[PDB]
Amino acid sequence: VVGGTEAQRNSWPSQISLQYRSGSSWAHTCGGTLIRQNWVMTAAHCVDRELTFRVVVGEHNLNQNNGTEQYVGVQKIVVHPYWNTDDVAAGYDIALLRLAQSVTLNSYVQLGVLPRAGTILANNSPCYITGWGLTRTNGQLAQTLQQAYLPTVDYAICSSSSYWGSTVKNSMVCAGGDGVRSGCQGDSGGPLHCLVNGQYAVHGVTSFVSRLGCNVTRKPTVFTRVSAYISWINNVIASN
Ligand code: NA
Numbered sequence: 001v002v003g004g005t006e007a008q009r010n011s012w013p014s015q016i017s018l019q020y021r022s023g024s025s026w027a028h029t030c031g032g033t034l035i036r037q038n039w040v041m042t043a044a045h046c047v048d049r050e051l052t053f054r055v056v057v058g059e060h061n062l063n064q065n066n067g068t069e070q071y072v073g074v075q076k077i078v079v080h081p082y083w084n085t086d087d088v089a090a091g092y093d094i095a096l097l098r099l100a101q102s103v104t105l106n107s108y109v110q111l112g113v114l115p116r117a118g119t120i121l122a123n124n125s126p127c128y129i130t131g132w133g134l135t136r137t138n139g140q141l142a143q144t145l146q147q148a149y150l151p152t153v154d155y156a157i158c159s160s161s162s163y164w165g166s167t168v169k170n171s172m173v174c175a176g177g178d179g180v181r182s183g184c185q186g187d188s189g190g191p192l193h194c195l196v197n198g199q200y201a202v203h204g205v206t207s208f209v210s211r212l213g214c215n216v217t218r219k220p221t222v223f224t225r226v227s228a229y230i231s232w233i234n235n236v237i238a239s240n
Contacts, residue, residue, distance in 0.1 A: 001129055001130070001131050001132075001133050001135065001142065001146040001147070001148045001181075001182075001183065001184060001187055002133075002134070002135060002136060002137065002148070002180075002181060002182050002183075002184050002214050002215045003148055003180045003181035003182070003215060004129075004135070004142070004146030004147055004148035004181065005146065005147060005148070006144045006145065006146060006147075007060075007130060007144070007145040007146060007147045009060045009066070009068075009108065009145075010107050010108060011147070012128075012130050012145065012147070012191070012193065013058075013107065013108050013109055013110035014033045014034045014035075014110055014111060014112030014113075014191065014202065015031060015033065015034075015059075015130050015131070015145065015190065015191060016031065016032045016033065016034055016040055016055050016056060016057050016059070017031065017055070017056040017059045017062065017132065018030045018031065018032050018040075018042055018046060018047075018053060018054075018055055018074075018097075018189060019053065019054050019055075019056060020049075020051040020052060020053050020054075021051065021052040021054075026054060028062055028132055028141060028186065029046065029051075029186065030042060030043065030046040030186060030187070030188045030189035030190065031130070031131040031132065031133075031186075031187060031188070031189050031190025031191070031206070032046070032055070032097070032189045032190065032191075032205075033112040033190070033191045033202050033205070034057060034103065034109070034110070034111055034112055035096075035111060035112055035114065035233070036111065036237060037102035037103055037104075037105065037111070038098060038099045038101070038102040038103070039096055039097065039098055039099065039237055040055055040074075040096065040097040040099065041094065041095075041096055041097075041112070041202075041205060041226075041233070042094075042095055042096075042097060042189035042190075042205065043093045043094060043095065043188050043189035043205050043206065043207055043224065044079045044080055044083040044085075044092065044093045044094055044095040045085065045088060045093055045188060045189075045207070046095070046188050046189040047077050047079065047095050047097070048085050053073075053074040053077075053097070054071055054072065054073050054074060055071075055072050055073075055074060055097065055099055056069050056070070056071055056072075057069070057070050057072070057103050057108075057109045058070055058106070058108035058109045059145070060108075060144060060145055061143055061144045061145075062132055062141065062142075062143055062144075063143050064143075068106075068108045068109075070103050070104065070109065072099045072100055072101050072103060073099070073100035073101075074097045074098070074099065074100070075097075075098050075099060075100045076097070076098040076240060077095060077096075077097055077098075078095060078096045078097075078098075078236050078240065079094075079095040080092040080093075080094050080095065080229070080232065083095070088207065088208050089167040089168075089169075089208075090169075091169050091171045091172060091224065092171075092224075093205070093207040093208075093224045094205055094224045094226075094229055094232075096233065096236050096237070098240055112191060112201075112202040113199065113200070113201045113202065114201060114202060114226055114227070114230060114233070115194075115196070115201045115202075115203050115226060115227040115230075116227065116230070117227055117228075117230035117231065118227060118228075119196075119203075119227040120155075120225075120227070121152045121154075121173065121194055121196070121203060122152075122154070123152065123153065123154035123156075123157065124151045124152060124153075124154075125151060125152040125194055125195075125196075126149070126151060126194065126195050127149075127150050127151065127152055127175050127192050127193060127194040127195075127203065127204075128147045128148065128149055128150065128192070128193045128194075128200075129147070129148050129150050129175065129176075129182075129183055129187065129190070129191075129192050129193075129206065129221065130145060130146065130147045130148075130190060130191060130193065131145070131146060131183070131186065131187035131190040131206070132144075132145060132146065132186055132187075133146070133183060133184040133185055133186035133187030133188075133190075134184040134185050134186055134187075134214065135184070136184075136214075137184065137213040137214045137215065138213075139184075141186050148176075148181040148182070149181065150175035150176035150181060150182070150192070150220075150221065151175065151176070152173060152174065152175045152194070153174040153175060153176075153177055153220045154174075155168070155170055155174075157174075158174035158177075158220060158222075162218055163177070163218050163219070163220070164219065164220075164222070168222060170225075170228075171224070171225050171228045172207065172222050172223060172224060172225055173192065173203060173204045173222075173223045173224075173225045174220035174221070174222055174223070175192055175204065175220055175221055175223065176215075176220045176221050177216075177217065177218050177219060177220030177221075178215075178217065179215055179216060179217035180215060181215060182209060182214045182215040182216075182220075182221045183206045183209050183214065183221035183223075184209065184214035184215075185214070187206050188206050188207065188208075189205060189206060190205070190206045191204065191205065191206075192204030192205075192206065192223045202226055203223070203225070203226055203227065204223025204224065204225065204226060205223055205224040205226060206221065206223050207222050207223055207224050208221075208222045209221050209222070
């Protein structure tokens with residue numbers, strides 16, 4: 001997350017770290033959101049690689065013991081059937097991971113709340129992106145969980161030529177684009193939390209940013225619109 005601030009350690013209890021085995025150790029690769037005690041929602045492109053994955057919940061500082069982490073293997077990966085790895089702009093960048101064991105809920109570990117199906121945010125709605133992503137374009141991962149304030153940018157605007165043009169679809173949400181704050185590598189798969197009717201819900205799964213750099217003016221970060229996939233998600237969890 002570029003231009004973020006460190007999160008309080010109990011602000012975003014549905015945030016997870018998806019990590020892969022790198023030698024004798026694990027490295028953070030992307031984010032995701034706990035949606036059942038044994039299911040996580042992330043971006044399809046995060047699990048393109050044939051790696052060994054684990055999920056970490058109750059994480060805050062990636063490089064120190066917090067005393068709150070639970071570590072759980074990934075048992076099954078279900079990617080959206082229409083996902084196409086060499087066409088992120090077509091959409092369907094979403095995947096569900098069934099965990100090996102169900103995690104225990106507490107103040108650091110809670111299920112993310114999903115919007116009702118069809119829900120679209122008005123232009124300029126207050127949202128936060130969270131994650132451990134690069135803190136600068138071509139920079140390094142944050143140590144501690146970051147959050148950044150990113151107002152939504154409605155489809156009519158984000159799909160205009162000076163923004164994203166036709167590359168953005170109705171099945172996506174755009175947020176930010178001020179050139180100071182944005183998503184960045186390592187944030188992918190992570191939540192966009194938006195405050196609606198007093199309650200934060202996860203409206204977005206971080207999907208892409210410009211190749212020109214993470215925080216570029218009029219290129220808001222693009223997220224998969226969770227409220228477009230509610231039935232998909234339910235169908236998958238019901239059938240697995
Ligand atoms: Na830690």
